[PDB]
Symmetry: C3
Subunit: 529 residues, 3 copies
């Protein structure tokens, strides 16, 4: 009953999902109980072919069928999924839903100031993505190119990512807060042929110099032929360099509201996302197309319990993986609306998140514990002003969630009527690795619980390098086989990838984190090592 190693697990009562979760659920859940989850999970570990093939055919639309579900090993860094298949990410995120229901909302955009907020339908999104992709195509962007994005969290960032993917090019999103030198490093490592940005940004009421930093960086980025500049503030004193910089509205007005998507192979790169590592300069994590999209759709459907009637609010930023997988690809693949918030949880007041959740009857909310701490400190009383009865799944990501913060989140935001998903994962995993499925897995505050489909998690003794048998254990967290959404390389530097992830413990994927596993199989993340 007691734990000698996993001290966090002693005297922790399981927390079943509240009845109101199932009352607010629009349809029968996707999994009935934990026993069915464990059957499906064991099948996903022992027979990835027969588990993931059918799901890949169910959740994604293919332009060419695949012939092999899974190939490669971790030790050889040659992982591949759905080999021979062809598809397009923008077709799966936009076109098919637009044909099905063009007036269904897609991007619920909340601007830094609410007066500028708007809503794009899937039909709208198809037209705007097509026009921007037509601009990029006229400029010579084609499959195999990279295109940089330097935009805030708003419709233009989503449209730019989808338009780049529509051509089979790989987008490289650069968080709008980066310095000119960070922009330069990333652009040059990726050899981007084009950049998409805006003139200025609005954050918490303040105006941010965006094009200015781009211009500073581009003096050292010779590969950038053309820049597309959105008029976010329309400030006339913002310089565009003749022959390089063009306005978003002016160029998109020249092209039609439909452009054919370009088919890419399952293993063609979908994007580069640059991350800081423990050794040296930024490294470009490369994600494939089919595997990443399947992981995004699968984790969004099963871990958050997303249905067609639902509305996801991922309070993240597309500059990071969270916005990639769960503000954009995850929800759009499933054809539900997603809320794109440009501002901050404090402007105009600390009720912004909640005013938004009420306004759009959001059903899912996904945020990092940092924001939870900020709102507990400075804006608790605001929560009661707004109706949050539409929610049933509350997500937490990025860092450990202390039991204190977990209980506060559960009571004040969830009104003790929602399910909480502590999702553990990382930029290189593509999608959730360990997380409690909504309406299925009972919670232990501070614990991410069970590994997800295709994630064969294990603990390794660092001193010896040997895998640790049995529960009530602690050690380095690692995965014993690759999974569909695993990152495939570091751009033009596969040796760094091998040394970072595959070579510390040959045969395993090294997460860089230490964790504990208790007598129930629940995992407790203990941070970086």
């Amino acid at each position: 009953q007691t734990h000698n190693v996993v001290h966090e697990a002693n005297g922790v009562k399981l927390r079943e999902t509240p009845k109101e979760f199932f009352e607010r659920q629009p349809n029968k859940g996707h999994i009935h109980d934990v026993n069915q989850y464990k059957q499906m999970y064991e099948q996903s570990i022992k027979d990835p072919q027969g588990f993931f093939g059918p799901l890949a055919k169910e959740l994604l639309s293919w332009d060419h069928d695949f012939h092999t579900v899974k190939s490669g090993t971790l030790k050889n860094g040659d992982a591949a999924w759905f080999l021979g298949g062809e598809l397009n990410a923008s077709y799966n995120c936009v076109d098919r839903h637009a044909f099905a229901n063009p007036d269904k909302p897609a991007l619920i955009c909340e601007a830094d100031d609410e007066k500028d907020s708007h809503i794009l339908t899937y039909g709208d999104l198809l037209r705007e993505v097509s026009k921007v992709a037509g601009v990029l195509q006229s400029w010579g962007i084609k499959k195999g190119d990279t295109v940089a994005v330097y935009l805030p969290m708003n419709a233009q960032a989503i449209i730019a990512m989808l338009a780049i993917a529509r051509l089979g090019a790989a987008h490289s999103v650069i968080f709008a807060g980066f310095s000119a030198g960070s922009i330069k490093d990333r652009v040059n490592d990726a050899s981007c042929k084009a950049l998409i940005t805006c003139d200025e940004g609005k954050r918490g009421g303040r105006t941010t110099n965006i094009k200015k930093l781009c211009d500073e960086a581009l003096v050292d980025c010779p590969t950038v032929e053309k820049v597309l500049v959105y008029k976010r503030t329309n400030n006339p004193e913002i310089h565009l360099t003749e022959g390089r910089d063009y306005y978003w509205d002016v160029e998109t007005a020249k092209f039609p509201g439909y452009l054919p998507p370009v088919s890419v192979n399952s293993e063609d790169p979908l994007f580069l996302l640059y991350t800081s590592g423990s050794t040296g300069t930024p490294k470009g994590v490369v994600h494939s197309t089919a595997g990443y999209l399947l992981g995004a759709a699968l984790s969004t459907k099963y871990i958050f319990d997303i249905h067609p009637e639902d509305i996801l609010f991922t309070a993240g930023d597309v500059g990071w993986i969270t916005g990639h997988t769960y503000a954009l690809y995850g929800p759009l693949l499933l054809g539900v609306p997603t809320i794109i918030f440009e501002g901050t949880p404090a402007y105009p007041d600390y009720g912004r998140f909640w005013q938004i959740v009420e306004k759009h009857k959001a059903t899912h909310f996904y945020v990092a514990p940092t924001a939870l701490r900020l709102l507990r400190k400075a804006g608790e009383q605001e929560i009661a002003k707004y109706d949050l009865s539409s929610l049933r799944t509350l997500g937490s990501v990025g860092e450990p969630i202390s039991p204190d913060i977990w209980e506060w989140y559960n009571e004040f935001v969830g009104k003790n009527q929602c399910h909480i998903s502590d999702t553990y994962w990382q930029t290189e995993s593509g999608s959730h690795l360990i997380a409690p499925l909504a309406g299925v897995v009972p919670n232990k505050p501070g614990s991410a619980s069970y590994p997800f489909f295709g994630i064969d998690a294990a603990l390794i003794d660092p001193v010896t390098g040997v895998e640790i048998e049995g529960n009530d254990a602690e050690g380095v967290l690692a995965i014993k086989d690759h999974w569909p959404s695993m990152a495939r390389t570091v751009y033009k530097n596969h040796t760094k990838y091998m040394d970072t992830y595959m070579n510390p413990y040959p045969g395993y994927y090294f997460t860089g984190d230490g964790a504990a596993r208790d007598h129930d199989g629940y995992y407790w993340i203990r941070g970086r090592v």
Copy 2:
């Protein structure tokens, strides 16, 4: 029986298809009668998916299947057909027929002088297209490029077009009678990477300077990297620029007679065709939808069977040659007669001599040529055996009842069906036409709208559809159709403003028409160019006249431009006098007819409102003034 509006139709007896038509028809007709036509037409309007899906699979060969038959709306300018599909135009016009019957004639080429005439089979055409496509491929031409063609109406023009389409590039054919400036404008707007032309041309016995005008134009066309030059006259004095120009024969001899075609998407551009009042605009046509329209209209309106032979006396420099000298007939796998010369050379019987020589079953020509031959060569017609013909088409302009009767009697001997085909460059293929052997004729009427064409008459003042027959108004189309043009090259806003925004929810043909008690349409010609300001349609000419009535005004020019709020805005070029002129227009025309702004200028273009249009959107010397005052 009487018409109070459609005066053309009063006292007009229907003209049934003559029995000789069905005697000469090689097989059972494709449609039995008008009732079957109407059932099929109603399905093509109410259920485009169930009507055009099966036809697209029947008439075209696909590399990848389509998942959606029809997408988009006119209002949003995002029409698309057969989404997800892949195909190749040259495979559908050449390869499949060559594999089925390589010795069947494809291009029956009649040169300016008959001594130079020849016939290419489908196998011959496959080899020549493959070799030219190999030359272009070795030069770097690929999907997404544009390639200019400046060639007379002969085998090399057809081969060039098909070879460019074989690589998935888009051809832009430039009528060989165009000047150097016209070549330059079109090549630069399209940013063509290569050009295919010839040294000189032969027309009416005269030698025309083709390569010379090309050089003149190319001095200012930096995107053209290479030129392929056919030796039409083999004149040794014709200079080739080293490193840029290469000979057709020399380069094609280096490559094999088969080259794989490149699959393109249904909505990838097949061609740009530049149109000749203001600035030339590149009408862009898709691949799958355009080809389907070409095949469908050629088959059903002309009644084309595998045994038939089509003579379209047009020029690939224009949409008629594109669609009914090349794509339509070759798609159906029949021979097409490509005539390089004039109706008068060596004499005024040449058209009829060609029909007799090749036993053509179908003849398609513009009323302009019919009038010329009636005036100068009538007696020549009877000198030739024209009994192989059963379908006589007319295109491009109204055919008066009198010219229709002359055509019917002197060419058709009262034994052929006449198809007065109404359509335009932007429609891709026939919009309103009497189906051969099916629809009875009223001379001068185009008769019924074609498959997928939901035609209507619109009140020009209110934009509201006119219900019932015995009516007149603006001819408009209520939904897009497979072969509708998709954009204006790199200028989609001009496309929207020209076709979709004047009457939102409709396609604007620019023509007026009348509809009689039988549902037959009578084309009435161009309308008067209204500008749409927040739903009020204004006449630039009326505003100019009203401004001119003011005796202190010397000259007035009124133009329209795009406006994100009011759709269009009106700018007049001519502090207190400006207000006086605006009030003058308000009290002469109406309160809402006032220009958005009156700009007092001392100069205006003529040497031409086009300059004013471009100026308002941010004697050559005069130009400066226009700009200066607009800066005011």
Copy 3:
């Protein structure tokens, strides 16, 4: 009849049935039941190519897109095409599919010049290395429609380079590692290659060969080559790499992952260029398509050699030549079996090396040229008894005639009279076997290639009348009456040369350049080239190219090169040279050596003349053109038979020619 009045080779020749031990060692039921089934299937392959080759193409190749038409075009119009509309990838069919099925199965059994450096790559290993090299090439801009040169010895890196280039839809052009810098230059420039794959140095017979050095020398004049990939075969640090152009195989492949998607190409997109010598002077890049070439390779390897999944093939060839292309690489790898890639010579460390390798790996199939058989019979017979060769059942011979005596020697000393011998007739332009005895099916006549293969409708044409010869006991020009899947499709950027060489000499036919005879049983007997092409030790040479090389020496005024029989190399090249101002018989030996070295450095060591004859002038017609017929007749000791020479402008010269050949051919 039983007697032959024309095909003398066939008189008194007893058929040689397949020995029973062949069937004892055969691992499964044969692919063909007996010779009658072979004849039924062959007739279908001629009368109904669509119904015969469609199903086989669907069985043996994996398609990304199905084909809609099996066969198109005619020889006369030079527009042959097969499996139109199809899409596939050669590296997927040679690697990926087998790696997915059995990643640990051996693929490349690599025997290095020194056995200590030997190793084995599995299909999984091969997939990873091919993917990495393809990743390097892709990052350099190589894409479908480009050509990439390979200048590598016969080892794993050559195979990997070829497959990596094909993985991107680019066409490889392999340049035999015995070529000089000028030959590399000619081929690289005619193809406009964007990149080159080579190595620092080579190992042959224990000697170190200069590979990268010759590449640098040639590349000074190859402006289209943007980047070079260099494998460290010896890792000699003194080997210079040019900054900005040359990069190391290991360094660059370490940057990319072990899987890269293959690029789908059309059946008729070019798979490779192989530069071949003819009666011209300039090498011609023979172009092979993808689907048809691969189908021919798989089909001939499977049916003529009787290859099964359990078998192991040792083709003692070099990828620098078509034999290595088709039967060391594409054929076996398509069929998913291991192939032995031998970097060395038959003589090093001793003359048992071939048999040591066969025994080491229990090879079931061995494929070699008669030149090597003659060498081993002369110098290494005593080695054979040291080795267990009982794993073998199919012994192939390629590239040149196999005399009845050599056939018997091969049959007895290597096969122990228990193996089937496959004398395979074919050529670079045919892609795969044209006439050959199917192992276990066709009985042999020693010296005869036997029956034409599937899709090969062979004929004999009267050299006087140009008319096809009906009936048997006949002789004439060997021609083929319709194209076949693996037929070469063009000469790179010179289709007119292709037409003039192969399709126009005998309209409606393919001209092989060979003469042949057909006996009363329908067996074909190859009689050798009719077009004066010379084959020295399996290498096709251009007498005109050798003449040009000799003339480059400014001491030479005129040069005429001819071919003759040679007991060692099959044919030998004899060069006749007239000098400007020479004389002095003491300088003769030295100047002859100088000219031989000139040829060695212009073309390559293997193109050196057997002998250089210094004469005072060459025989010429009234029009001033050299009459090589006289030099041929003299060089074969047939001075009698020269006949009336009063038609020459300089009949007096003939005497000298004869005397000179008598004095100098020996010494």
